[PDB]
Amino acid sequence: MGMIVFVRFNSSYGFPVEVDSDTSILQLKEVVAKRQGVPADQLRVIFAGKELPNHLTVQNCDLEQQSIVHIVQRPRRR
């Protein structure tokens, strides 16, 4: 109980985040906004070829135990 999803932000590897079925994408983004000092509205979550919107929750999308997501910043100088 209590799932782990790994979060990769500007790194080659993702850190473990305890989440559950009710955790939303916006909330997950907020863990990174607080770690990087960047606003959550300038962050996006990409998972298994899908950029996931703020309101979706874990039980409402394909995230499962130990999924790894890639959080990127927008806008960001390329």
Curated annotation (Swiss-Prot):
UniProt domain Ubiquitin-like: residue ranges: 3-78
Tissue expression from the record: Expressed in all subdivisions of the brain (at protein level). Highly expressed in brainstem, cranial nerve, pontine, cerebellar nuclei, indusium griseum, nuclei reticularis, strata oriens and laccunosum moleculare of the hippocampal CA2 region. Low levels were found in the telencephalon and diencephalon. Expressed in heart, liver, skeletal muscle, kidney and testis.
Protein's cellular compartments: Cytoplasm, Cytosol; Nucleus; Endoplasmic reticulum; Mitochondrion
Highest taxon of source: Eukaryota
Deletion consequences: In brain, increased protein levels of p53/TP53 and CHPF. Cortical neurons display a slight increase in process fragmentation but no dendritic retraction.
PTM-bearing positions, type Phosphoserine: 67
Entry PTM: Auto-ubiquitinates in an E2-dependent manner leading to its own degradation. Also polyubiquitinated by RNF41 for proteasomal degradation.
UniProt similarity note: Belongs to the RBR family. Parkin subfamily.
Biological role: Functions within a multiprotein E3 ubiquitin ligase complex, catalyzing the covalent attachment of ubiquitin moieties onto substrate proteins. Substrates include SYT11 and VDAC1. Other substrates are BCL2, CCNE1, GPR37, RHOT1/MIRO1, MFN1, MFN2, STUB1, SNCAIP, SEPTIN5, TOMM20, USP30, ZNF746, MIRO1 and AIMP2. Mediates monoubiquitination as well as 'Lys-6', 'Lys-11', 'Lys-48'-linked and 'Lys-63'-linked polyubiquitination of substrates depending on the context.
Subunit text: Forms an E3 ubiquitin ligase complex with UBE2L3 or UBE2L6. Mediates 'Lys-63'-linked polyubiquitination by associating with UBE2V1. Part of a SCF-like complex, consisting of PRKN, CUL1 and FBXW7. Interacts with SNCAIP. Binds to the C2A and C2B domains of SYT11. Interacts and regulates the turnover of SEPTIN5. Part of a complex, including STUB1, HSP70 and GPR37. The amount of STUB1 in the complex increases during ER stress. STUB1 promotes the dissociation of HSP70 from PRKN and GPR37, thus facilitating PRKN-mediated GPR37 ubiquitination.
Comment block on domains: The ubiquitin-like domain binds the PSMD4 subunit of 26S proteasomes.
Protein name in UniProt: E3 ubiquitin-protein ligase parkin
High-level lineage: Eukaryota, Metazoa, Chordata, Craniata, Vertebrata
Stretch of the intact protein here: 1 to 76 of 464
